[PDB]
Amino acid sequence: GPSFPEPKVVRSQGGLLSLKLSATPTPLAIAGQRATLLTYGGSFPGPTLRVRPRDTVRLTLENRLPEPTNLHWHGLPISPKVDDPFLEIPPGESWTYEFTVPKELAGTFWYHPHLHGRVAPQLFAGLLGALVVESSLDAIPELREAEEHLLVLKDLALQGGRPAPHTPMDWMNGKEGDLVLVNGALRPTLVAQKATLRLRLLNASNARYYRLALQDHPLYLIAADGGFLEEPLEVSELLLAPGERAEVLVRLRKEGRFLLQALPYDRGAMGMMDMGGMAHAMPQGPSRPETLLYLIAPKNPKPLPLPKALSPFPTLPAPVVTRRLVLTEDMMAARFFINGQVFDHRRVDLKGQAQTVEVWEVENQGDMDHPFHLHVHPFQVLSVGGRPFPYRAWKDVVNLKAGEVARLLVPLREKGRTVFHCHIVEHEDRGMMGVLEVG
Amino acid sequence: GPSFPEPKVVRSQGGLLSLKLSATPTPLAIAGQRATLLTYGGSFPGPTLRVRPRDTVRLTLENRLPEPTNLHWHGLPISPKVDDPFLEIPPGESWTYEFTVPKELAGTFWYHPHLHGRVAPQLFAGLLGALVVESSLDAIPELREAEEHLLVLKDLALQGGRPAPHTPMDWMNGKEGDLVLVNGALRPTLVAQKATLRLRLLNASNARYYRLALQDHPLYLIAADGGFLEEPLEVSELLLAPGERAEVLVRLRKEGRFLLQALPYDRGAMGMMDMGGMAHAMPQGPSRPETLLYLIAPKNPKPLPLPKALSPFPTLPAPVVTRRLVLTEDMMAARFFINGQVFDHRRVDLKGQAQTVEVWEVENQGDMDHPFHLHVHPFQVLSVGGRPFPYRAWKDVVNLKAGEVARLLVPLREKGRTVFHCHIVEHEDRGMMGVLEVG
Ligand SMILES: [Cu+2]
Ligand SMILES: [Cu+2]
Ligand SMILES: [Cu+2]
Ligand SMILES: [Cu+2]
Ligand SMILES: [Cu+2]
Ligand SMILES: [Cu+2]
Ligand code: NA
Ligand code: NA
């Protein structure tokens, strides 16, 4: 096949993407070994769904797992009556998700399970795939002429030909695996045919962070989780926390082989040691560097000019309320809290008004990084840790290092009950989730 | 002194730059050796004059040379009654140039002799200096915060402690020297203190070309000969022909030492060989590579963002005439022609109307590169060799390789008699110059 593996794409046809997926244990070859994963559509990752604004999506999920499951349409501003975090699809049953893609939308999104208490093992076992919303902006020459690729970053650990089970330490830290894969492949080679690449990046890992850097090159950020930036932003590296997405342009500068690496990054994961007194928790420290893929530049590369503008960011109405959410940890219990409470699906924590704008101040009073995710209502990150954000774009996950406060501008869109939670999904399963009701 | 030598600057004071220069043989230390050069203001290069639009310049040139001389205010759109190519200042006499700097003007210009038949030996011996027109655009943060330097590129050859005399081959080719200097210094070191440099570049050589490339870096072109571009233009290298100027931003990417080089370039200079029959002219081929300076980047360089816009280029009226100028050579005679004629100061070759726009098609039917210069009336280069120019900016010198046609948009500004000529100044002295009268 093509030197660079990418998930099979399913495109809407005549404005309709109508598809039956099964969530099923699946024998696969992965990273040179045979394994049984839990997959959508028989593949790992699941198929990439590619749609346009105003398309209808009709997705029937058949549950062939021994456990209940459901779907979260991560990042899509649709109704929480469709993107329903409380729905359970029992084993053997099916459910049809039907929605219209919003008009003012573009970017890379994804789908994965969201059945509270079961997300981490289901996501770790392989249940995830991408959704791309194509934009009329993709026709501008500086993007149309770029070579486009999707990079699904997800790690895995295997034991006896199956995903390794969660340990107690995994529930505390979030599980990371030793197989650090791109599109399910181990260190694939991307042989570029054009000098400009457009890379859609998705961190679909349970807990692993990717401090992305391409040898000898900057990256040009053109989209965040849920939409384009206003103009490209040059960066030397790009941290992608669990659940985050980005799109970057790469402008290949000369012939040769360049590594795309996940550089060392310390997210605050903890180990245990015994040195006499003890036993006591100790930091794991930074991750070991990983090579994600090999990028081969073409002969005599002449990259296109960057686009000068992308999409203007909407002017938002003045906000009507300020919220404060505080994140705390009980690491030895593997319990995680928002404002001192664990998730309770019967308890509404915040009540807001549709079509108003709110300011959310999310404060990490723990020692681990926590990537904060809000369903249904994309937000604008104003500042994190007291540093203004260098661009305007829609996001739906924001990473908070220990001690940091993120200030978010949250326009409330669709009415209904939805959730916010840590996207280290072990922490969500262990309680770090709350309920927002919009009316 | 400062590790990077630059000419002393003379600034206008209260809107007036009033200065007496003497053109004089001057004992100097240059490139580690003692030499007697012909200088303005006792230095090589002469002092940099720094003015703003609407300033008055009052420059009294005292001629202390044994030959007549004059000044050409290269690139300034002022009256040819001030910038007078036919004026002769006899030995021992003085002349005061007085003009107002035009309102809509910015960039790097320069001054040098323009007494027909004597330019090449006077310019080669050291008579040149820079003029900078400061702009309100210099206050935008992306430029204000850059570290600015002027680089006067000029080569020299010494014989018996004096500039080497012209040979017959020098009159045919244009004289190049073995000492390839920046600001009169041999391979100086520029120890950058900021991560973004703004470099004003001037090729003040008689005939040498500089195919400029900075190791491991692109250059961002922000101004051509006579004004800013509309937006920065990324280039991997930049060819500066005799008389041309440019301004570039350099965005230092990492710590280290980076050479700024004049890469090999074949301008069509000719030698003579005898292999049996003979003797016959043979191409010299490409120049040998030269290191111009050593650039030391600071620690942990974080360059500023590029400006997104510079200055919009004026919309010009539709043109009223098309001209054709053809350049030809008689190399073995060292005679050079425009439309089949050599310069005659009594003969008007073109007659145009002030405030109209003309299209000039300049065609090089020789085998050497010829850099075509027009006094008094800056032009917009539309295309060269059938390739559209990638930016809009005012230029006053355009390089033509063998066979190439340049199409120029020439707004005629000040009334009076002026000249156009090759800026390989040996070729001008040997006849490749014509007269334009604007009325
Ligand atoms: Cu998600
Ligand atoms: Cu967390
Ligand atoms: Cu969720
Ligand atoms: Cu000149
Ligand atoms: Cu010439
Ligand atoms: Cu001239
Ligand atoms: Na299946
Ligand atoms: Na003097």
Q: How many residues can be counted in chain B? A: 439
Note whether A41 and A160 are same-domain residues. Answer: no
Q: Which amino acid is at B294?
A: Y
In the three-class reduction of DSSP (H, G, I as helix; E, B as strand; rest coil), residue B5 is classed as coil
Nearest Cα residue in chain B from A306: B234
Cis peptide before A45 (omega within 30 of 0): yes
* Structure-token pair, residue B145: 């915060």
> Per the structure block, which two tokens stand in for B182?
């920046």
User: Strand B94-100 vs strand B56-63: parallel, antiparallel, or unpaired?
Assistant: antiparallel
Q: Which residue has the tokens 């100061």?
A: B345
Instruction: Name the residue among A234, A232, A252 with its Cα closest to residue A303.
Output: A252
Residue in A49, A38, A96, A39 with CA at minimum distance from that of residue A75:
A49
CA–CA–CA angle B182, B264, B336 (5° rounding)? 85
Residues 6+ apart with CB under 8 A from B2: none
Q: Which two tokens stand for residue A25?
A: 């244990």
- B387 and B410, same domain (yes or no): yes
Nearest to B375 by CA among B53, B114, B60, B57: B114
With residues binned 3-state (H G I as helix, E B as strand, rest as coil), the percentages for chain B, rounded to 5, are: 5, 50, 45
Is B422 annotated for ligand binding? yes
**CB B308 to CB A305 under 8 A?**
no
Is the link from the previous residue into A279 a cis peptide, with omega within 30 of 0?
yes
Which residues lie below 8 Å from residue A321, measured CB to CB, with a gap of 6+?
Answer: A352, A356, A358, A359
Alpha-carbon distances of A373 from A262, A333, A343, A377, A397, rounded to whole Å: 22, 23, 14, 10, 4
Q: Do residues B399 and B360 make contact, with C-beta atoms less than 8 angstroms apart?
A: no
Q: How many domains does chain B have?
A: 3
CA distance A178 to A155: 7
Give B185-239 as a DSSP string.
EES-EEE-SSSEEEEEEEE--SS--EEEEETTB-EEEEEETTEEEEEEEEES-EE
Within this chain, do residues A75 and A160 fall inside the same structural domain, yes or no? no
The rounded Å distance from CA A234 to ligand 4 centre is 39
Helix, strand, or coil (residue A296): strand
Half-sphere exposure of A6 (CA within 13 A, CB side): 16
Which residues in chain A are contacts of B234 at CB distance < 8 A?
Answer: 305
DSSP-derived 3-state class of residue A45: coil
Q: Is A66 helix (H, G, I), strand (E, B) or coil?
A: coil
Q: Please report how many Cα atoms fall inside a 13 Å half-sphere around the Cα of residue B233, on the Cβ side.
A: 18
Same domain flag for A178 and A270: yes
Q: In the PDB record, what is the listed experimental method?
A: X-ray
Write out the two tokens for A105: 């939308």
Q: Which of A375, A386, A378 is nearest to A434 (CA)?
A: A375
CB atoms within 10 A of CB B124: 29
Residue A198 shares a structural domain with residue A282: yes
Domain containing residue B437: 312-439
Side-chain-side CA neighbours of A402 within 13 Å: the count stands at: 8
Same domain, A170 and A304: yes
| CA–CA distance, B241 with B430 (Å, rounded to integer) | 19
Cα B299 to Cα B287: distance, rounded to the nearest angstrom:
35
Question: Which CATH number fits the domain that encloses residue B147?
Answer: 2.60.40.420
**Residue at token pair 């290069």:** B45
The answer to whether residues A30 and A95 belong to one domain is: yes
Q: How far apart are CA A309 and CA B438, in angstroms?
A: 43
Reduced to 3 states, what is the DSSP secondary structure of residue A289? coil
Q: Which ligand is nearest to the CA of B397?
A: 4
Compute the distance from residue A285 Cα to the ligand 3 centre, in Å: 28
What separation in Å is there between the alpha carbon of A178 and the centre of ligand 2? Answer: 20
Question: Quick one: B150 and B284 in the same domain?
Answer: yes
Q: Which position has the token pair 């203004």?
A: A388
Same domain, B302 and B156: yes
CA distances (Å), B397 to each of B225, B227, B410, B424, in order?
7, 13, 12, 11
HSE value, Cβ hemisphere, 13 Å, CA-based, for A207: 31
Shared domain for B214 and B339, answered yes or no, is no
Burial status of residue A331 (CB atoms within 10 A of its CB: 0-12, 13-18, 19 or more): middle
To the nearest whole Å, the CA of B228 is away from the closest chain A CA by 18
Q: Report cis status (omega within 30 of 0) of the bond before B47.
A: no
d(CA A278, CA A274): 5
**Do residues B64 and B22 touch, judged by C-beta distance below 8 A?**
yes
Distances (CA, A) of A264 to A156, A247, A269, A286, B162: 18, 21, 13, 5, 61
CB of A308 within 8 Å of any CB in chain B? yes
Residues sharing a CB contact under 8 Å with residue B309, sequence separation 6 or more, in sequence order: B230, B231
Tally of residues, chain A: 439
Determine the residue type at B9.
V
Ligand 1 centre to CA of A112 (Å) is: 6
Rg of chain A over Cα atoms, rounded to whole angstroms, equals 21
- Rounded Cα distance between B101 and B226, Å, is 13
Nearest one of A79, A78, A331 to A226, comparing CA atoms? A78
Name which of A234, A305, A308 is nearest B308 (Cβ-Cβ). Answer: A308
DSSP string for B358-425: EEEEEEE-SSS-EEEEESS--EEEEEETTEE-SS--EESEEEE-TT-EEEEEEE--S-EEEEEEESSH
Measured in angstroms, the resolution is: 1.8
Residues B72 and B147 placed together within one structural domain of the fold: no
Cα separation, A409 vs B365, in Å, equals 65
Out of A271, A288, A311, pick the residue that ends a domain: A311
Instruction: Mark which of A72, A99, A134 sits at the end of a domain.
Output: A134
Instruction: Find the residue in B nearest to A302 (Cα).
Output: B236
The DSSP call for residue B277 is S
Place of tokens 């109307």: B353
Consult the annotation and say whether B149 binds a ligand: no
> A19, A64, A70, A20: which is closest to A39 by C-alpha?
A64
Cis peptide bond prior to B139, omega within 30° of 0? no
Asked if residue A95 and residue A41 are part of one domain, the reply reads yes
Whole-angstrom distance, CA of residue B157 vs CA of residue B120: 13
Dist CA A206 CA A122 (whole Å): 10
| CA atoms of A83 and A392, how far apart (whole Å) | 26
Chain A CB contacts of B308 below 8 Å: 231, 308
What does the alpha-carbon distance between residue A182 and residue B289 come to, in Å, rounded to a whole number?
A: 44
CA–CA distance, A236 with A242 (Å, rounded to integer): 20
Chain B residue nearest residue A305, CA to CA: B234
Instruction: Report helix, strand or coil for A143.
Output: helix
User: Is residue B423 annotated as involved in ligand binding?
Assistant: yes
Write down which residue in B286, B311, B336 finishes a domain. Answer: B311
